[PDB]
Design a protein around this nucleic acid. Structure first.
Lengths: 216, 134, 185, 260
RNA sequence: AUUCAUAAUAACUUUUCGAAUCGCAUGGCCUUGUGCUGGCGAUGGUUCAUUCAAAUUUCUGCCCUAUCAACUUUCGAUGGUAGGAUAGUGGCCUACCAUGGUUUCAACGGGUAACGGGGAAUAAGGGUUCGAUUCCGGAGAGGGAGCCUGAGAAACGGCUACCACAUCCAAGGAAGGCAGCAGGCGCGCAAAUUACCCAAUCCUAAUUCAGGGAGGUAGUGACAAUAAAUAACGAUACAGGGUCUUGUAAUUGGAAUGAGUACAAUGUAAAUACCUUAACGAGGAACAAUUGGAGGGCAAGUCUGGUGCCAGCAGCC
RNA sequence: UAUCUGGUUGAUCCUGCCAGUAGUCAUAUGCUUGUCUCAAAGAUUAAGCCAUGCAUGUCUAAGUAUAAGCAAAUACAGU
């Protein structure tokens, strides 16, 4: 999440299915956390999982335990009571200790989600990469300012968005358009079970990461 | 911190472990506490004790301060003071070095890994080396 | 997988809580003796009811019964040592006629107020609570101490507790520092 | 339940050990030996709870493995060795001896004895049979089997086994008028004289015992340990001599000894 | 109380036992030979006794149901005989022979959200209800069934097969059992740490030494329970009771102290925390207490304003 | 010592029910939750299903040491 902006923050709270909400332990709760929690509560609450960082800055165990209890009870006020949150110790090698990260991975590898009302009728889409498709001669000849044809890639969630061209589309923070064309590219990061199913139709050792938005 | 009074009551002589056992109580009307190394030094100079053969280990300060009651004991001929004392109290007095091991999870995991081989395992090592090398 | 430790309730909420007679009676009790709330009165009433049940069970027993003699002598000696029963009232007919005001009088709050140096039961309560009382030579800060009869004459200020000398407290040091750094120069 | 039990929890230990119910959830559980485990005493309880010569269990083990503690003249290195009645537990580091006898309150008492009289021990002979090759033998209350006894030594009597190799010394017959210790029931620790033996065929004979204050009681036959003639016990009795005063005069004696 | 203990005669046996073991000591004798003899132990071994146990076992005592009155007895049900098997008694099983055994004092069948007891609560007493659960006994290790080893298991952190689930892969095969400690799923509506240690209590072994999620320590939703802070003493002006006793105040004066922070020391296996303490830490004590209710019943409002309607008076107050 | 008051009546009395106040080793839930001591915690519905880690191993002077193991009595002798 871009922390300073509220706009994409609201879009994230509208879209996300699991939200890892992180709080500085030594500082306390901040206004961004409260604003995101209220936006998520009003727009349809997703699965919220709290994590607290900067806990090695505490110099005494008594203050650390009391602050952990206070943060946990404030979280239990904002979220359902008994909700468990994770305590992260240090950043000693640019990353967190292995046990806490293991428990974070284990909790979200067995959890199930709730059917929200808004997600189950309106189709939505998370865009993973971006490409502008215009001819460079069209860019050069008529002054670089004519509005463009843009093809964007991503994953569909919620509802089937019909295969007829011209269905109306809203892009949050941009506006309202009508889509010219759509197609289904093959999935670039398939599950392994999909790969044994494919191999069974004819009868990915390291590419578990698909990040076209960033560089390798 | 004006003065400290050191009184050893209930003294029982134990020739079974070759020591003397007692309940110390200290009147320390001002300072903070007992300062157990300093208290050990003065209890050593009390009898004739050769300080490393003196062990005071139980202590509790009475509510309101000033009075602190604990249990301690003094050996003789410090060789069996090293023989008969527990290891943690020997380390606490500087008479031993704290040994470094792995945690219990790592030790138990190492034991369970070594449980899965029969013999020294050099045969299996050479077999898997020649199998996965070629 | 261990031995259970014993515990008991020390009070009992009345079945008829807000009837006016017991309400203003316990209001008078908590006002004259400076009690914090109504659990003090209920606790003292629970102790009085236990003593009354013991005295009734002993008085139903026959005279010169060794059980009656032993437990009656023990109970009367205990209440004399506490300070409730008078020295000329060592009979079971008189412990069946006891009252909660005898137990409320015996507590440390009143017993430091009645000896002077406190000037009100609430100043006595605050003085005890703020870690000042020295019973014998031991610092007491519990207002329901129930002072023993033999220990009634040893109540004084601590070797700590700056009203008994020994380096006056923090706000006096604050005032001295302010008068030294600002009023001094 | 599928085999023998090796643990004994606190609240299941015998009450006469005086083990506090806090500070641990397990009891010593004395091993197999000469005495029944509910009428015996482990060496750890004697060296720690009674004598207070040790502070932990490993200190008791360090005492025992140093070959200091001897039961009936023999070195024992067992932490939970079941010492019981009439044992001659002795310590040579302190040059100090004990005889395990019951206090009048119903528990084993600390009864220091001299160097002499720590060289013999009374044992209630409990069965007299005939062994292999026609050799008569007796066995007593602590499993001591003695070959070739006196022909007048009958069942349910006492014998004087010294320390070394059995070799029964002078014995006394079970009869009316003898001095008797009570080693069971609610009359535990009381000493008296037999006045009648109410014999019952089928089982469970009864003994009527009158103490030195002429306050009689009755007990079963198997809780009777004859320990000498009237006015002369064959050992040194503990403090109080087994009188069982009621709580009133015990309290009065406590205030009599109270002060200065 | 015995055909008991034990002894004796005759024989018998795929026939047992009666030390071919280990450590630490270097003594004594002379025929002066690595001669003779000899100490303290460790471990095995036959039987008896003992101890830790186990298996059967006598008497009496369990909730509801008659819209359950007859039940067992083919294919053992009651008993006698002989045998097999058992560690041993025994219809435990087998061959034979009798026809028995239980019951209106309730046999038998059925239900039980029925493990039993010590115990818990409500009572003045009798009763009534609860007891999965810190101790004792029993049973089980997803459901039947069988077995090896061993003194002891019909053992499941042992084995074999069947039933139901279910893991791996190269498709040939291998492997499984959290009603142990953590932890997860079982609804999309939720509840302790996949932490530290054998220091204490004890248990195991060849064994002072190793091991122990048994157990202890700390963490975690106010289970339940104990004690207890959030203020105390004044001066001034009004209101009083009226010259000595109180309330009110965007009035004021100094004392006292811990909730927290923290050198130190104690504590502890190492810690956290408690107890102790140099220093910091209070006027809006902002270092900021809550949950309900108000004619009654078993307490505290004959308090205030606003709203919907009226074919009631006036007509927009 | 042992907590009841009304309605069901115009009164007098059974019988059940309702409204109210109070006590709860009773279940569930809400709000609030500074200190000390203490100690309960997947039975209630499912003896339903389980990822991963651990939970049973053990050596004395005294059973077997030629480790081409480690340091320093030509039969071995420490660990």
């Amino acid at each position: 999440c871009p922390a300073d902006d509220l706009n994409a923050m609201i879009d994230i709270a509208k879209i996300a299915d699991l939200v890892l909400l992180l709080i500085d332990g030594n500082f306390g709760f901040e206004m961004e956390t409260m604003e995101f929690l209220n936006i998520a509560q009003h727009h349809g609450m997703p699965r919220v999982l709290g994590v607290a960082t900067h806990l090695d800055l505490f110099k005494s165990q008594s203050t650390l335990r009391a602050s952990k209890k206070r943060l946990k009870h404030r979280f239990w006020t904002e979220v359902y009571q008994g909700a468990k949150l994770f305590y992260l110790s240090g950043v000693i090698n640019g990353r967190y200790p292995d046990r806490e990260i293991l428990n974070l991975s284990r909790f979200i590898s067995v959890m199930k989600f709730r059917p929200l009302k808004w997600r189950n009728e309106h189709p939505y889409m998370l865009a993973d990469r971006f490409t502008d498709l215009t001819h460079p001669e069209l860019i050069e000849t008529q002054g670089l300012q004519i509005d463009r044809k843009v093809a964007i890639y991503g994953y569909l969630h919620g509802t089937p968005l019909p295969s007829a061209p011209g269905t109306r589309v809203h892009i949050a923070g941009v506006g309202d358009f009508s889509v010219a064309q759509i197609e289904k590219l093959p999935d670039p990061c398939p599950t392994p079970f999909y790969q044994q199913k494919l191999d069974d139709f004819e009868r990915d050792k390291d590419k578990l990461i698909y990040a076209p938005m960033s560089d390798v | 911190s004006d003065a400290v009074t050191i009184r050893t009551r209930k003294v029982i002589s134990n020739p079974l472990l070759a020591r003397k056992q007692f309940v110390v109580d200290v009147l320390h009307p001002n300072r903070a506490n007992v300062s157990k190394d300093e208290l050990r030094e003065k209890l050593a100079e009390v009898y004739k004790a050769e300080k490393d053969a003196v062990s005071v280990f139980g202590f509790r300060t009475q509510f309101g301060g000033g009075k602190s009651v604990g249990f301690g004991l003094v050996y003789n001929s410090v060789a069996e003071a090293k023989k008969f004392e527990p290891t943690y109290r020997l380390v606490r007095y500087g008479l031993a070095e704290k040994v470094e091991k792995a945690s219990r999870q790592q030790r138990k995991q190492k034991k369970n890994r070594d449980k899965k081989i029969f013999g020294t395992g050099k045969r299996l090592a050479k077999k898997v080396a020649r199998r996965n090398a070629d | 997988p261990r031995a259970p430790r014993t515990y008991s309730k020390t009070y009992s909420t009345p079945k008829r809580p807000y009837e006016s007679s017991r309400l203003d009676a316990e209001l008078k009790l908590a006002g004259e003796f400076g009690l914090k709330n109504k659990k003090e009165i209920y606790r003292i009433s629970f102790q009085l009811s236990k003593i009354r049940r013991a005295a009734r069970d002993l008085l139903t027993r026959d005279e010169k019964d060794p059980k009656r003699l032993f437990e009656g002598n023990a109970l009367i000696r205990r209440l004399v040592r506490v300070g409730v029963l008078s020295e000329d009232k060592k009979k079971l007919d008189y412990v069946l006629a006891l009252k909660v005001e005898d137990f409320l009088e015996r507590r440390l709050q009143t017993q430091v107020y009645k000896l002077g140096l406190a000037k009100s039961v609430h100043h006595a309560r605050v003085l005890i609570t703020q870690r000042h009382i020295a019973v014998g030579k031991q610092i007491v800060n519990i207002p329901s101490f129930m002072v023993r009869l033999d220990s009634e004459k040893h109540i004084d200020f601590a070797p700590t507790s700056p009203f008994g000398g020994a380096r006056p407290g923090r706000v006096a040091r604050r005032n001295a520092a302010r008068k030294a750094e600002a009023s001094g120069e | 339940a599928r085999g023998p039990k090796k643990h004994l929890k606190r609240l299941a230990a015998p009450h006469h050990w005086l083990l506090d119910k806090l500070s641990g959830c397990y009891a010593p559980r004395p091993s197999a030996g000469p005495h029944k485990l509910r009428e015996s005493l482990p060496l750890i309880v004697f060296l720690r709870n009674r004598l207070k010569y040790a502070l932990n269990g490993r200190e008791v083990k360090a005492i025992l493995m140093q070959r200091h503690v001897k039961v009936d003249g023999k070195v024992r290195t067992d932490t939970t060795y079941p010492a019981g009645f009439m044992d001659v537990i002795t310590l040579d580091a302190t040059n100090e001896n004990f005889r395990l006898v019951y206090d009048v309150k119903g528990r084993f008492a600390v009864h220091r004895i001299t160097d002499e009289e720590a060289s013999y021990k009374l044992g209630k002979v409990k069965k007299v049979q005939l062994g292999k090759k026609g050799v008569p033998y007796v066995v007593t209350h602590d499993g001591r089997t003695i070959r070739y006894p006196d022909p007048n030594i009958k069942v349910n009597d006492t014998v004087k086994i010294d320390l070394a190799s059995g070799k029964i010394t002078d014995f006394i017959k079970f009869d009316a008028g003898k001095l008797v210790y009570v080693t069971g029931g609610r009359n535990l620790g009381r000493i008296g004289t037999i006045v009648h033996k109410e014999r019952h065929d089928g089982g469970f004979d009864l003994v009527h015992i009158k103490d030195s204050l002429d306050n009689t009681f009755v007990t079963r036959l198997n809780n009777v340990f004859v320990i000498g003639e009237q006015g002369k016990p064959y050992i040194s009795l503990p403090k109080g001599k087994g009188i069982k005063l009621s709580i009133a005069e015990e309290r009065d004696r406590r205030r009599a000894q109270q002060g200065l």
